[PDB]
Amino acid sequence: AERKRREKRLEETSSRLEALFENSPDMIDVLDADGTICEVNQRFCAELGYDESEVLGRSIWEFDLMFDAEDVQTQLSGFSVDERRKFEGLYERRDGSTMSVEVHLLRFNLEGEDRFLAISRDI
């Protein structure tokens, strides 16, 4: 009974947090220090017309026409832990159309790891 209780409440908590992330009205992605996409919400995928399998594990410069690989390296490297910055990006959708966004980017520590949390909003 204690086991099943713990499991059931853990599911309920997780489910609510998952809905809050996936349904956020803004696009959300998480990067490692290499610019690799570690996580993305469904809002990010839907706005760009990609399946999450076409986004996770890929590099963020593949999606932002305003930044190449070096540009992204330079951007990420300058952040202090807990620093936030806002800047313009230009995402390329799966169909080749584009989306002008303002990205609000945070360097933070996630599960012991150096990560970046990006919230993108259509301009």
Q: Which residues bind Mg ion (CB under 5 A)?
A: 71
Query: Binding to ligand I3A (CB under 6 A): which residues in 89-118?
Result: 89, 103, 105, 118
Query: Binding to a copy of itself (CB under 8 A): which residues in 10-29?
Result: 10-21, 23-26, 28
Residue whose entry in the numeric block shows the structure tokens 């908590």: 13
Q: Taking the CB of residue 75, how many other CB atoms lie within 10 A of it?
A: 20
Residue 23, C-beta contacts closer than 8 angstroms, at least 6 positions apart: 41, 42, 43
Q: Which chain residues interact with a copy of itself by CB under 8 A?
A: 6-7, 10-21, 23-26, 28, 30, 39, 84, 86, 102, 104-106, 108, 110-111, 117, 119, 121
